């Protein structure tokens, strides 16, 4: 009953706009676990883990919406993989 993990990195106007707060909220709403963090190249990165359909909904959110004041240029997804079990028990803002 298939769980996946995927890494993400979001490019655009994504800092100074409460991106991490909104990402955590949306991930939790979708029953996802993982994490979100700001990077030193100005992007937002993290991992998403959960059922495929929920992860995919979140991937879409990360492509077009993000936080209200944000302007997303590109969401890069990497290392999509099936997992035996969740590696996380919550969705953390790493900060």
Residue numbers in the entry: 4 to 98
Verbatim from the authors:
Despite remarkable conservation of sequence and structure at the active site, the catalytic activity of the thermophilic PhAcP is significantly poorer as compared with its mesophilic homologue HuAcP at low temperatures.
Two variants of HuAcP were constructed. Secondly, a pseudo-wild-type HuAcP (HuA99) was created by replacing the C-terminal residue with an alanine residue to resemble PhG91A. In a good agreement with our original design, the salt-bridge between the C-terminal carboxyl group of Gly-99 and Arg-23 at the active site was only detected in HuG99, but not in the pseudo-wild-type HuA99. Regarding the Arrhenius plot, both HuG99 and HuA99 exhibited straight lines that intersected also roughly at 298 K. The salt-bridge bearing variant HuG99 illustrated a steeper slope of the Arrhenius plot, i.e. a stronger temperature dependency of the enzymatic activity, as compared to that of HuA99 lacking the salt-bridge. For instance, the thermophilic PhG91A is consistently less active than the mesophilic HuA99 although both enzymes lack the active-site salt-bridge. While the two enzymes have similar values of activation enthalpy (i.e. similar slope in the Arrhenius plot), the differences in enzymatic activity are a result of PhG91A having a more negative value of activation entropy.
